[PDB]
Short mmCIF file of C-alpha atoms and ligand atoms in Angstrom, two decimals:
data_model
loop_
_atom_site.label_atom_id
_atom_site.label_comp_id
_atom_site.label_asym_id
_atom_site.label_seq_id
_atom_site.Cartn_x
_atom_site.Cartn_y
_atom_site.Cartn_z
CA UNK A 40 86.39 81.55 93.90
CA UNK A 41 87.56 78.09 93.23
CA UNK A 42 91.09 78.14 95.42
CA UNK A 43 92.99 76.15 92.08
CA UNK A 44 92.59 79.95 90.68
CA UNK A 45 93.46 81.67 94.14
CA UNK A 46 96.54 80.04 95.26
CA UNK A 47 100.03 80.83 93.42
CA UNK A 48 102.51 78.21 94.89
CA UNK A 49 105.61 81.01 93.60
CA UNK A 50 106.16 84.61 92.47
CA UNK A 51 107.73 83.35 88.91
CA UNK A 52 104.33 81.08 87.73
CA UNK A 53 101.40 81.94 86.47
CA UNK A 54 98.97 79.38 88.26
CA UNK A 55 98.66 76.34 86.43
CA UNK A 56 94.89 76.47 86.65
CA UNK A 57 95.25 80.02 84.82
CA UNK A 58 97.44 79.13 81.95
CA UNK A 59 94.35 76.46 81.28
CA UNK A 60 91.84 78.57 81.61
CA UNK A 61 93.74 80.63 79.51
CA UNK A 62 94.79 78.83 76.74
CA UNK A 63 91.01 78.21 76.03
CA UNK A 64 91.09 81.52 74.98
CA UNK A 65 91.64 85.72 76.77
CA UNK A 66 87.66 85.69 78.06
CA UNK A 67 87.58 82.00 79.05
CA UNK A 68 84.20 80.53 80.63
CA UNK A 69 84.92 78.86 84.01
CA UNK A 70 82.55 77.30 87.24
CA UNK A 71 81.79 78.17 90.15
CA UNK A 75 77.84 78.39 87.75
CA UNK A 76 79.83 80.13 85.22
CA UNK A 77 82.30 82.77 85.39
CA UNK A 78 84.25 84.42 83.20
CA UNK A 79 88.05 84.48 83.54
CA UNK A 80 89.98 87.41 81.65
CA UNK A 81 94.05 86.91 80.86
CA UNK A 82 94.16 88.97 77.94
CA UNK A 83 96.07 92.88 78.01
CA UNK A 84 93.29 94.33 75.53
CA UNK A 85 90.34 92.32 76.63
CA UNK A 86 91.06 93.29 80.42
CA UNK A 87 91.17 96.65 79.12
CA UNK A 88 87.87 96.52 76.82
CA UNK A 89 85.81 95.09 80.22
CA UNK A 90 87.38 97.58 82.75
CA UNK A 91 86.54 100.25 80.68
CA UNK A 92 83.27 99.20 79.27
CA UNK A 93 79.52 100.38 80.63
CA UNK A 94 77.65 97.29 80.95
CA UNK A 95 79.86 96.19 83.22
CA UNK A 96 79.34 96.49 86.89
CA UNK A 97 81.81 97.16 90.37
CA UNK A 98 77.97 96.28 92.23
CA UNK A 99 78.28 92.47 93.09
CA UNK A 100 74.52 92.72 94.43
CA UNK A 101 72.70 95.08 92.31
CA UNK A 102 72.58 92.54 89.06
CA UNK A 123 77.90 101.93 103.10
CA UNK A 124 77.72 105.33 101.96
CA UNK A 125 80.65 107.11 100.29
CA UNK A 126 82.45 103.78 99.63
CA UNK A 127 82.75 103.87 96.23
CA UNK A 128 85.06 101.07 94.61
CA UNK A 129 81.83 98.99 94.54
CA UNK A 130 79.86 101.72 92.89
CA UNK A 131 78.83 102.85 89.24
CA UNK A 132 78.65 106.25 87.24
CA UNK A 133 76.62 108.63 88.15
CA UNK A 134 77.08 107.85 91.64
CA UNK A 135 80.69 106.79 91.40
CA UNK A 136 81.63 109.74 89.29
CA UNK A 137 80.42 112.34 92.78
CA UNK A 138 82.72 110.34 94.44
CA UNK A 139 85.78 110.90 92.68
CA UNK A 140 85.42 113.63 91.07
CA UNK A 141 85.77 115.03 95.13
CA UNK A 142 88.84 112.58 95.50
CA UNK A 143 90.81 113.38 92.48
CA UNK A 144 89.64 116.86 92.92
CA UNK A 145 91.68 116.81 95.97
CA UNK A 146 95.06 114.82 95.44
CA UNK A 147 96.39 117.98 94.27
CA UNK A 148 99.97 118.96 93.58
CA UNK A 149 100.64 120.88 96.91
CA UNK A 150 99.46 117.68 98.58
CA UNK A 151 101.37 115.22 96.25
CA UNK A 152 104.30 117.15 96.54
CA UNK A 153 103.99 117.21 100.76
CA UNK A 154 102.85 113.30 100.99
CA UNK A 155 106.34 112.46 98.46
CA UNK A 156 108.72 114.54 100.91
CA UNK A 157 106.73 112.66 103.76
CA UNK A 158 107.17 109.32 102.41
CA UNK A 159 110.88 109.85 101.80
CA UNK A 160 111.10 110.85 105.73
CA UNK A 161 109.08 107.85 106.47
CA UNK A 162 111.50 105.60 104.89
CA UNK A 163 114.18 107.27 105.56
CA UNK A 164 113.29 106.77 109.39
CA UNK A 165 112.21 102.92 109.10
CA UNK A 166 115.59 102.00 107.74
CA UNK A 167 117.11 104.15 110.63
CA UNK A 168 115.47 102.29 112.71
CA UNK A 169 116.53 98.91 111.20
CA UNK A 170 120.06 100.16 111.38
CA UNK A 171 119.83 100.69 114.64
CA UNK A 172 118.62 97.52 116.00
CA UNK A 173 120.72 94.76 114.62
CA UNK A 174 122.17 93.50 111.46
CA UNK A 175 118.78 91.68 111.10
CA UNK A 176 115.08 92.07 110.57
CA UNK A 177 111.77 90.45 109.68
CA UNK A 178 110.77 93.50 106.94
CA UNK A 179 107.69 93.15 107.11
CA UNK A 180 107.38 94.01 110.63
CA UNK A 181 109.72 96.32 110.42
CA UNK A 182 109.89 98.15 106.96
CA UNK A 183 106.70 96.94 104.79
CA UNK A 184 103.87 97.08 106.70
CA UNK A 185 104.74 100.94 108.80
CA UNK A 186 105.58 102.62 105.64
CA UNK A 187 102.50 102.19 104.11
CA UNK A 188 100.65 102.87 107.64
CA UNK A 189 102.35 105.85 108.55
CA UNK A 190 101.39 107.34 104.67
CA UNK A 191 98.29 106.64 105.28
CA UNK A 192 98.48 108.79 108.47
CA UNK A 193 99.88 111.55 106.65
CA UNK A 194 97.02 111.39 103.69
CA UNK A 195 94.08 111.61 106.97
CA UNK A 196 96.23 113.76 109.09
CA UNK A 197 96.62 111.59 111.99
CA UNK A 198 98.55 113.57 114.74
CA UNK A 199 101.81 111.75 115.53
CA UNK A 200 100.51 111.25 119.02
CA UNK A 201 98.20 109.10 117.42
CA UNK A 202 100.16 107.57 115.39
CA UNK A 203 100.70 104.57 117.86
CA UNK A 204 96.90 104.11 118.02
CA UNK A 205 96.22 103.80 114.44
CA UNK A 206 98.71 101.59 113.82
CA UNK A 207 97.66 98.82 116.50
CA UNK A 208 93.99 99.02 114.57
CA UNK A 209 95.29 98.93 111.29
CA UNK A 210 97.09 95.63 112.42
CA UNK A 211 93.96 94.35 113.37
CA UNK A 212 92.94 92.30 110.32
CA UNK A 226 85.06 99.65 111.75
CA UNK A 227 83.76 99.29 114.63
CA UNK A 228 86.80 100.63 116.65
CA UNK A 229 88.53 101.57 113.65
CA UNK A 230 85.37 103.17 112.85
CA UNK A 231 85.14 104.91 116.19
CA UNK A 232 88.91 106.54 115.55
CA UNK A 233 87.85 108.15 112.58
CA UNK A 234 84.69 109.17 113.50
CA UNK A 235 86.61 110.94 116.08
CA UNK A 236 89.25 112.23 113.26
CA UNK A 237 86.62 113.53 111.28
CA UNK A 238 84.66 115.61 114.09
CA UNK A 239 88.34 117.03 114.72
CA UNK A 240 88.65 118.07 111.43
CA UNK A 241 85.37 119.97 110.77
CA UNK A 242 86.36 121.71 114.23
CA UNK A 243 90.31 122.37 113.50
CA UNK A 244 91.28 122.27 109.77
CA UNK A 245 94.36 121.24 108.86
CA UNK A 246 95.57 120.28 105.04
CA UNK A 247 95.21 116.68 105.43
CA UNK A 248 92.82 115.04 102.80
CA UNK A 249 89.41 114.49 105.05
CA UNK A 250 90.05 118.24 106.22
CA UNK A 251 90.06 118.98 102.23
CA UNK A 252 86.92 117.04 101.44
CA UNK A 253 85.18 119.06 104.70
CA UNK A 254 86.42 122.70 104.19
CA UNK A 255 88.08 122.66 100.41
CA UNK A 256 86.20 120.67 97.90
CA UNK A 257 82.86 122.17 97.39
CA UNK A 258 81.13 119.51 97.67
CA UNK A 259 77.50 119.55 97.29
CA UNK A 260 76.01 117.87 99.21
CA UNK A 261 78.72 117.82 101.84
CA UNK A 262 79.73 114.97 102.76
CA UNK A 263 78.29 113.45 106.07
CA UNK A 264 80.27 112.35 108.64
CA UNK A 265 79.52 108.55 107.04
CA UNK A 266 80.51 109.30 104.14
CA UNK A 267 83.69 110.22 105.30
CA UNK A 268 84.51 107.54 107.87
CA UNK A 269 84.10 105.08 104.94
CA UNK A 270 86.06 106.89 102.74
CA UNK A 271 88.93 107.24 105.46
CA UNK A 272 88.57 103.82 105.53
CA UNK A 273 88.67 102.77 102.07
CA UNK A 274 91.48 104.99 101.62
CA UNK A 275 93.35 102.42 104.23
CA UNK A 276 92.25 99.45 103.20
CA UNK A 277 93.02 100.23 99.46
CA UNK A 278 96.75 100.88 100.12
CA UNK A 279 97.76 99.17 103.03
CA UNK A 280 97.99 95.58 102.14
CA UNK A 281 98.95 96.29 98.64
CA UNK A 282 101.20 98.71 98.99
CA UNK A 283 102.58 96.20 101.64
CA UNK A 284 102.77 93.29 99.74
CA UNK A 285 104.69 95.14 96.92
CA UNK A 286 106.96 96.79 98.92
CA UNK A 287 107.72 92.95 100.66
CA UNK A 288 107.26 90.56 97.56
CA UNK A 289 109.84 92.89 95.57
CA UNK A 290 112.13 92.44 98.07
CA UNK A 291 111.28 89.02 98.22
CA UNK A 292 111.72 88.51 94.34
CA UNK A 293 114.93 90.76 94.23
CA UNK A 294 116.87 88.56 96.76
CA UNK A 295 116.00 85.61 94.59
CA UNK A 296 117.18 87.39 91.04
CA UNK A 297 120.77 89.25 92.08
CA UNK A 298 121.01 90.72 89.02
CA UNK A 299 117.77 92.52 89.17
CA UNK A 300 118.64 93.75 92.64
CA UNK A 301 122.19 94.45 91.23
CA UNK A 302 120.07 96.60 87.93
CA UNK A 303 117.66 98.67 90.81
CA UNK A 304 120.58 99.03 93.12
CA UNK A 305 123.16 99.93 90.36
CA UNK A 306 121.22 102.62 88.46
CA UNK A 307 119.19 104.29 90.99
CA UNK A 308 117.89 106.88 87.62
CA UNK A 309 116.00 103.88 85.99
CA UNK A 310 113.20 103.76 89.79
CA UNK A 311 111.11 104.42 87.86
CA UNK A 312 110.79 101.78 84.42
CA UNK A 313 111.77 99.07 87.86
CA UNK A 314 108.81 100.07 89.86
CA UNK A 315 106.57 99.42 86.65
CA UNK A 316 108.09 96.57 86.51
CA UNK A 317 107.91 95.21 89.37
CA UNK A 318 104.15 95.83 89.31
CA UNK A 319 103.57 94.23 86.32
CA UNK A 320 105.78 91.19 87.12
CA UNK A 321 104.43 90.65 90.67
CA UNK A 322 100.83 91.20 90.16
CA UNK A 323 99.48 91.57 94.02
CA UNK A 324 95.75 92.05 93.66
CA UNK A 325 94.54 88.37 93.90
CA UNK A 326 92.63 86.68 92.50
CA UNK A 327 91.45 89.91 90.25
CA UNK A 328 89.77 92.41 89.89
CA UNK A 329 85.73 91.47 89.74
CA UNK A 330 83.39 92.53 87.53
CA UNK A 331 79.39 92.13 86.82
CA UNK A 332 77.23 91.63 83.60
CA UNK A 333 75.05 94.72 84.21
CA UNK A 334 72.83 92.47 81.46
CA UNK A 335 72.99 89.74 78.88
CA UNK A 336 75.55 90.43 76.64
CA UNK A 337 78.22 89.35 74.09
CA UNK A 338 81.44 90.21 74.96
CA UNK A 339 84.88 88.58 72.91
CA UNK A 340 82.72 86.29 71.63
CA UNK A 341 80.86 85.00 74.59
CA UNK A 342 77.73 85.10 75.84
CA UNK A 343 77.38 86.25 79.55
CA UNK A 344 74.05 86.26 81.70
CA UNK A 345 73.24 89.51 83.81
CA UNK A 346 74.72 89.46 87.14
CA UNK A 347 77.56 86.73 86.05
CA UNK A 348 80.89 87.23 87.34
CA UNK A 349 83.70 88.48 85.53
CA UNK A 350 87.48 88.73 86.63
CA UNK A 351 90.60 90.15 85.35
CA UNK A 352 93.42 88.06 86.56
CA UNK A 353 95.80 91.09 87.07
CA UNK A 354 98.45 87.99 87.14
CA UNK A 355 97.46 86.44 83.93
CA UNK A 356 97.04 89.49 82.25
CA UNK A 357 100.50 91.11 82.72
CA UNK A 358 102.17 88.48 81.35
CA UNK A 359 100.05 87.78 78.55
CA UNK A 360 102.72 86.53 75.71
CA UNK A 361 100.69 87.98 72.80
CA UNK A 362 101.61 91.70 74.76
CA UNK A 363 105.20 90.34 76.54
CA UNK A 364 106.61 88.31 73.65
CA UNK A 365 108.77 87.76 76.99
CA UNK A 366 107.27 88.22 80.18
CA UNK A 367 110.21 87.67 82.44
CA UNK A 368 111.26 89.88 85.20
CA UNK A 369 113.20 92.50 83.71
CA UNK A 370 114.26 95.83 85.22
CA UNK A 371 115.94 97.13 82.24
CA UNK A 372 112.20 97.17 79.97
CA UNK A 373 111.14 101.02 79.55
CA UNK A 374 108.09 102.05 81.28
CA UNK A 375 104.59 100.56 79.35
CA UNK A 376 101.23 100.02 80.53
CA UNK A 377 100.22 97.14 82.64
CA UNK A 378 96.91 96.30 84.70
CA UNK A 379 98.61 96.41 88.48
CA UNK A 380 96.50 99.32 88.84
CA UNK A 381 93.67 98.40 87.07
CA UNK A 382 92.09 100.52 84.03
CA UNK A 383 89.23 103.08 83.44
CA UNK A 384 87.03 104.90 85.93
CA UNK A 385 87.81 102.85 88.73
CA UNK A 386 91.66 102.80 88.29
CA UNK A 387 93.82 103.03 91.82
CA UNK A 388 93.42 106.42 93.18
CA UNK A 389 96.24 105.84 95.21
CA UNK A 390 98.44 104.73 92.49
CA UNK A 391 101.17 107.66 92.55
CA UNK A 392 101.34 107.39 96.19
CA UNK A 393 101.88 104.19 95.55
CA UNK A 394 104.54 104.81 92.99
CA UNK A 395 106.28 107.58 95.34
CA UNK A 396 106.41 105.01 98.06
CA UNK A 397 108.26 102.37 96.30
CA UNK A 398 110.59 103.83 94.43
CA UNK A 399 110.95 105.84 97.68
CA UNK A 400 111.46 102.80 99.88
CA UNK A 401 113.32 99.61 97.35
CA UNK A 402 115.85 102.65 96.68
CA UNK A 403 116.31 103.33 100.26
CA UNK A 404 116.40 99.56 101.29
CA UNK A 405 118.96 98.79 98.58
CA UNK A 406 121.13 101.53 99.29
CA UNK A 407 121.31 101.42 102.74
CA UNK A 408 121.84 97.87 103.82
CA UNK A 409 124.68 96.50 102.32
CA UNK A 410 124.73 93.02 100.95
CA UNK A 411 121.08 93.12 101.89
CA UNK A 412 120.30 88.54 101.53
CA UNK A 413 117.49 86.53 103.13
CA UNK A 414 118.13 84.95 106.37
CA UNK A 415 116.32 81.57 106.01
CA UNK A 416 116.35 80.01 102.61
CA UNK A 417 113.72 81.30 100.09
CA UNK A 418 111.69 77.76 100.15
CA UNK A 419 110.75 78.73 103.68
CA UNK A 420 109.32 82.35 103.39
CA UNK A 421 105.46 81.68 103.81
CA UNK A 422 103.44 83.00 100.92
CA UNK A 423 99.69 84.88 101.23
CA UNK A 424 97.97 82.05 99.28
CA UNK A 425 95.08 81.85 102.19
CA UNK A 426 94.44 85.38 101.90
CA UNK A 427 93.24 88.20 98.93
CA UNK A 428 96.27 90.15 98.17
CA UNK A 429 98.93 87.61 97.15
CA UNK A 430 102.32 88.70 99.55
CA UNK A 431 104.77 87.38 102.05
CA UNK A 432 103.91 86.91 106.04
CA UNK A 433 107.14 87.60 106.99
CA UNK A 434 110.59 88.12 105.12
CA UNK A 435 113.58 87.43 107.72
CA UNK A 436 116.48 89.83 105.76
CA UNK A 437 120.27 90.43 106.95
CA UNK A 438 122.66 93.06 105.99
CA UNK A 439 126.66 93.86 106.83
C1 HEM B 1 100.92 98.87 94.98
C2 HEM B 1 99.92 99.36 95.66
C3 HEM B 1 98.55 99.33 95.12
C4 HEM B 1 97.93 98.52 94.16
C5 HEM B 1 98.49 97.36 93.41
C6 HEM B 1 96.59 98.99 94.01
C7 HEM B 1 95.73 98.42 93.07
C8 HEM B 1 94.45 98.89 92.80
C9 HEM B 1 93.56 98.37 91.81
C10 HEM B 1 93.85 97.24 90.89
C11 HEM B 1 92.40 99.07 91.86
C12 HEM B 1 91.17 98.95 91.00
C13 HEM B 1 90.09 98.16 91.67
C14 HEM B 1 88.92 98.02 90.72
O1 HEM B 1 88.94 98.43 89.53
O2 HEM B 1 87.92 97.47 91.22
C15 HEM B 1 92.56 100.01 92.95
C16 HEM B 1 91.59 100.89 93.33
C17 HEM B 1 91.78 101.79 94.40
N1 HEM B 1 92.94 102.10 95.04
FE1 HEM B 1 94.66 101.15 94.87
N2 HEM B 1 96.44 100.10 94.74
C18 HEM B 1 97.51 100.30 95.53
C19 HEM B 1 97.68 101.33 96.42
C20 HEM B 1 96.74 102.24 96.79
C21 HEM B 1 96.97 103.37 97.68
C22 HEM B 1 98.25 103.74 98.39
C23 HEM B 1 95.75 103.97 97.90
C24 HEM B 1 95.70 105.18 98.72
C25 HEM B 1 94.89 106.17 98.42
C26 HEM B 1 94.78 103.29 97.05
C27 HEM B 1 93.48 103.63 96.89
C28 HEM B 1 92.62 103.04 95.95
C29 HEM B 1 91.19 103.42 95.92
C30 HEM B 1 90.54 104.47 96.81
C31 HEM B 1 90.65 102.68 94.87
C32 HEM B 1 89.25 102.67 94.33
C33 HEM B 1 89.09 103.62 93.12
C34 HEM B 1 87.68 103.77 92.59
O3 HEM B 1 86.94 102.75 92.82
O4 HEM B 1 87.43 104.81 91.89
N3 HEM B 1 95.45 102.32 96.37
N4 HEM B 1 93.88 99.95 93.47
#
């Protein structure tokens, strides 16, 4: 809450505020009242994965379930992961390479110049999110000027999506969860509007933000770019990476004492908050003996995603999107540099999701 724990004035610091907190210990105390601030790998872990901790910021819209807890959480998505299944996986990954694939086309054929965000970072994710809820492509256009906008008119489009579906089944993911699943009870038509809709809200800025802040990052560290670039077989350990290093949910991921408890040593009142600085924690020195940007480091866990029951749903979409889109990028727009100098690209500090506004890019 406090913004000295929001704001990150650069990609390559932890925020000063952070390493205080942190250096008071992994589960640090901190004031609003108290909260709890977690920068430790295994103590982020331990809370994201243990019971008496709530996602329900009230307790201590139906169907919306990142702010709910087992059982009801568990109905939820156990229908979701029942339905990311490997015929749609495989579909949405040959999808997202056509959808990047066509942005950079596009790019090509405007100019030797582009803001990428407008351009490249913020329609990828949007049109693979209209492939996941099987927007038509005559709707395309439509979802996209909403999905800018940042219910009740996005709420009115797929309110109108989902009565399609039920009517004409197609193998989109709402037409799964209608037809498919088995759910019982089925799900209402609420239920699945806010689903729809945490679906895009889940994976559009973030994916976003990655896909721009790498770039971002890269341009600033040519030897990285020259390591992703160079060895297009390694996407994979530099995607990890780049999650890990970048750290775009902001300022964490939240948490609620279900309870008084002790947790790392501390003694937490029921209903206190508790947040996992996702930055804090994946470069936490006692895990990273050095937690420099390197593209080269092997594939290991990290906390971009989160941990436990609640961990991304959306995370190998995610994955297939940006290894799908830096590789494309990189090899397709040679010399690829920043058009302004770096000092001057305007961070998301004022905002949730830490990112760029705009990234002004040239190419040869
Ligand atoms: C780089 C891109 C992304 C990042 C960094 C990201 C990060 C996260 C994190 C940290 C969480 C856990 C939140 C928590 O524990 O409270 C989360 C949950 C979630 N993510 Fe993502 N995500 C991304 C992309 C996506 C995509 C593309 C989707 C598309 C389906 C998506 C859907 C979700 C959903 C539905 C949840 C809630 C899961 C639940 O509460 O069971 N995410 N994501």
């Amino acid at each position: 809450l406090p913004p000295e724990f929001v704001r990150r004035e650069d990609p390559f610091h932890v925020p000063p505020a952070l390493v205080a907190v942190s250096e008071r210990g992994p589960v640090a105390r901190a004031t609003l009242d108290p909260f709890w601030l977690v920068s430790g790998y295994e103590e982020a872990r331990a809370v994201l994965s243990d019971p008496r901790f709530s996602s329900d910021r009230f307790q201590y819209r139906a169907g919306s379930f990142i702010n709910m807890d087992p059982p009801e959480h568990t109905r939820y998505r156990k229908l979701l992961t029942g339905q990311f299944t490997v015929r749609r996986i495989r579909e949405l990954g040959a999808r997202i390479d056509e959808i990047v694939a066509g942005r950079v086309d596009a790019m090509l054929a405007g100019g030797t110049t582009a803001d990428l965000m407008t351009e490249f970072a913020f329609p990828a994710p949007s049109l693979m999110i209209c492939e996941l809820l099987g927007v038509r492509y005559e709707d395309r256009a439509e979802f996209q000027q909403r999905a800018s906008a940042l219910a009740d008119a996005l709420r009115a489009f797929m309110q109108a999506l989902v009565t399609d579906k039920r009517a004409n089944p197609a193998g989109d993911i709402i037409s799964g969860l209608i037809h498919h699943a088995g759910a019982d009870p089925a799900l209402t038509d609420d239920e699945l509007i806010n689903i729809a809709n945490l679906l895009l809200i889940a994976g559009y800025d973030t994916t976003a933000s990655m896909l721009g802040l790498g770039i971002f990052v890269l341009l600033q560290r040519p030897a990285q770019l020259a390591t992703l670039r160079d060895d297009p077989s390694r996407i994979a350990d530099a995607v990890e990476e780049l999650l890990r290093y970048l750290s775009v949910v902001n300022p964490g991921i939240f948490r609620f004492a279900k309870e008084d408890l002790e947790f790392a040593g501390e003694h937490i009142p029921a209903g206190s908050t508790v947040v996992v600085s996702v930055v804090a924690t994946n470069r936490d020195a006692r895990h990273w003996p050095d937690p420099d940007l390197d593209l080269t480091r092997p594939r290991g866990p990290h906390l971009a995603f989160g941990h436990g029951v609640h961990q991304c749903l959306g995370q190998q979409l995610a994955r297939m999107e940006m290894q799908a889109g830096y590789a494309e990028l990189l090899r397709r727009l040679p010399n690829v540099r920043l058009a302004v100098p770096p000092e001057e690209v305007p961070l998301r500090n004022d905002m949730l999701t830490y990112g760029v506004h705009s990234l002004p890019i040239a190419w040869d």
